[PDB]
Write a protein that binds this ligand. Sequence first.
Ligand SMILES: CN(CCOc1ccc(C[C@@H]2SC(=O)NC2=O)cc1)c1ccccn1
Lengths: 258, 14
Amino acid sequence: ESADLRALAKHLYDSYIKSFPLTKAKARAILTSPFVIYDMNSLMMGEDKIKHITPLEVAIRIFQGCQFRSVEAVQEITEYAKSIPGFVNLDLNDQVTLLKYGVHEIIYTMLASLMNKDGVLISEGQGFMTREFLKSLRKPFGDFMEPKFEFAVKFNALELDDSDLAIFIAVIILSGDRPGLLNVKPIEDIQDNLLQALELQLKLNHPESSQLFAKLLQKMTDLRQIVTEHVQLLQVIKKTETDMSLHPLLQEIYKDLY
Amino acid sequence: NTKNHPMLMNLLKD
Ligand SMILES: CN(CCOc1ccc(C[C@@H]2SC(=O)NC2=O)cc1)c1ccccn1
């Protein structure tokens, strides 16, 4: 029933607004004034002007900035997943497995909302770190962000809004082919109805773009690959890199990821 | 799964 799918779409958009303080609409409104970090000197100036708390090399520091952002993103995503009808019924083991494999895919999806072709909103939109600077970084740090920027440029061309993204994100979380799932049957059934809600959502909200649903689902596999390539580049520098020690939440997520 | 991932479980708990 179309109306039951419009009621699922509305519930997810309402929960998405409640779960994610920096939405794409606010991000677009800003990107169209945050402190611009574009080189070494503007970075050092930036973190005194500007979302990092602890007891106390630039590449490592920026990396710990992103880690800190991740940990809070997982918390928003977890609070959002819990509102997806039927998620809090799945085998608690499988809730954990969906979270585990879904959380970075959502992070990069929502990171695209904060990106344009030249940089990214940081620290809830009070900063803007340039793509060039991120690329200029040394060793393998200059390659962390670049695939995200390339994904975001293509993904942002779809012109999804937050109401679109609320269902797309939910579709991603409820993937039935995550390694180690116990009960894939009720997960696929939840996902199947989210996909119907997404499809109706895209035909109502984007009547003019044919095959947007098709283009969107192909992006889902892009996201999986981005995370897989990040997993490895993370395991690359856990050998050379002496100064990095991943946040506990993140080393738990990454543990036997890929 | 649930054995490992205590941090995930506790975010899911409430
Ligand atoms: C570029 N920005 C915006 C956020 O950009 C992000 C880039 C990567 C991640 C994923 C982290 S990083 C990692 O290796 N594992 C994770 O979960 C999360 C956010 C910065 C940069 C510095 C400080 C704060 N914000």
